[PDB]
Amino acid sequence: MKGTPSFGKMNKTPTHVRCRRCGRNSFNARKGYCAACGFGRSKKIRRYSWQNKK
Amino acid sequence: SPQQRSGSFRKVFVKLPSGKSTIHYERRKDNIARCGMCKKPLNGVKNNYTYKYSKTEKRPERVYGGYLCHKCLESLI
Amino acid sequence: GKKLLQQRAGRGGINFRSPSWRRVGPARYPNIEGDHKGKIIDILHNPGVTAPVVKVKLDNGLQFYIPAVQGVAVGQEISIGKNATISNGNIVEVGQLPEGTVICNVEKLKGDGGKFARAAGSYAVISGKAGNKVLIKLSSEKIVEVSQNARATVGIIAGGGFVEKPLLKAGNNYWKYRVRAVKWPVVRGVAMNAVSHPHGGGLHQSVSRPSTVSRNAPPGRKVGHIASRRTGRR
């Protein structure tokens, strides 16, 4: 069932672990990629121009 | 960390005068040494989990004694 | 609409790839250039291929697999090359064989491994000779044309009568496709919705148009009978 019984299976190992470069818990473990700074396939810091309103 | 078939359960009390019971986990038995195409392990050859360092205790004393009996051999000499 | 199943099957995701690590190896002729001799050392089962394979050892110590021929035993001696005789299991050249000789695992060029008549029970006959090439009649009744020095094996692929026993239940066909790439089970296109198939939609399940389609239809439309010349049972 969509709600309370299925949230019980959210106690395994997480999808995201700590990242050495940025110190945020955004390193996607299964893909070898930080979803916050790009560490893993970007040498440059992950940055986009939509990342704040103008 | 519960049960796994790659380990056999033992419980011991027959040869036994003290008084308690527990469980020991050992690895399954080995087999006479392996790869395969000719497929016959031998008679008189030894396989143990540890090695008693033996040399002639773990092999017969014929020409090709440890290799195989006179079956898959004479087309090699 | 959405992409069809055959359009998803072309991206080659793990749902549609072949589990080939479970087979003995590629069952092809090796590249050799003499008149050698071999010995059959084993007859094995190849999981998703329908024909058993033999393992051959050459006198210079070369290992390879080829589809087994009906009536060949383990420990038998076979010859390879242009001077090979006409016996079961021998790898010969098609330029040297008379008319009406039954062969299998026929190459098209010299050194491709074998192309035609490889599945279980299938064979080809020698049906003539062009100027530079020999004419071979395949099991589809068509005629193909191959080099003078294309290698072939003498005899019929083992495993005939394969299809004379009914599978008799849906689970006997569940394993069969566990080791193959075929998708099973198969949902009829009339049972889908209009977003997923050109046959879907409607109150009553029916192919809304004639099923025959042209050879020039874009992908996502070639369903039913493809460029048919005829339909009907007779």
Binding site: - | - | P52, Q70, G71, V74, G159, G161, E164, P166
Partner: protein, 65 residues
């Protein structure tokens, strides 16, 4: 129904009959081509057979040697 009696009343009378005639051909007493009918021949897989006396393995059809 013979050997086909292990299915019960499923699959249809004519479908069970075809299955039964193929199996009765497989389990006939076959004769070894190499030694003779001495040791009986058995199926390893589809197209793979051997005789249990001479230990000779060969390639044949799917349900008969």
């Amino acid at each position: 129904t013979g050997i086909a009696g292990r299915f019960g009343a499923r699959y249809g009378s004519s479908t069970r009959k075809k299955w039964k005639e193929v199996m009765e051909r497989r389990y006939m007493p076959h004769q070894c081509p190499y030694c003779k009918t001495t040791g009986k021949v058995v199926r390893i897989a589809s197209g793979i057979w051997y005789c249990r006396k001479c230990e000779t393995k060969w390639a044949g059809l799917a349900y008969t040697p």
